[PDB]
Amino acid sequence: EDYSREYSEVLLQLKELQDSEAFLEPVNWKKLGLDDYPDIVKNPMDLKTIGKKIKANFYTKAEQFWADIDLIWHNCQLYNHESSEVYQQSIRMQDAANNLRDML
Amino acid sequence: DYSREYSEVLLQLKELQDSEAFLEPVNWKKLGLDDYPDIVKNPMDLKTIGKKIKANFYTKAEQFWADIDLIWHNCQLYNHESSEVYQQSIRMQDAANNLRDML
């Protein structure tokens, strides 16, 4: 109970960050016309999906939660060029996520 | 350590969507709002809190969080509930309170 509520509160903190928009929901690559997205990104992840995993008790150690958080930023930095805005957004989200992990 | 925790809290709050109005002291003269100090008698903002962290003014966490609360209180006391800044301060307050509960 305590850990789950905590993970859910971490997600709220991340959602309300200035750069969170691109990471809120699964990438709908078909809608975006990005057919290669699933070829390059083998393990898609996003904040909404993490929330569903919390509700289903998929994180029985905190490191499993943080691995999925890290995976979101990894996917973005793998797929997109460093100079792109979404890449830069993911760097700022990653730094903020790491500050939260250090605090908690 | 506790000082470092407080600094890390401010890092999180500064990067929230609605943080911009709260980053620096209200310069009411620059804004033309002569009545601000007649209404807000104890100004506070995130940069000032940061200076207080550095100067060791928070001997207990409740003192830090009281100054955080004061930011949102001032905004809500001064501004109409229908104003955008008031609404911003409510979102900041809810995020801050949840963060405190996590620590």
TrEMBL record, chain A:
Q: Which residues form the signal peptide?
A: none
Q: Got a GO cellular component term for this one?
A: chromatin
User: Keywords on this record?
Assistant: Bromodomain
Is Disulfide bond among the key words of this record? Answer: no
One GO BP annotation of this record: regulation of DNA-templated transcription
Residue ranges annotated as transmembrane are none
- Domain (Bromo) ranges: 15-87
Record keyword Ligase present: no
Its recorded name reads Cgd2_2690 protein
Organism from which the protein derives: Cryptosporidium parvum
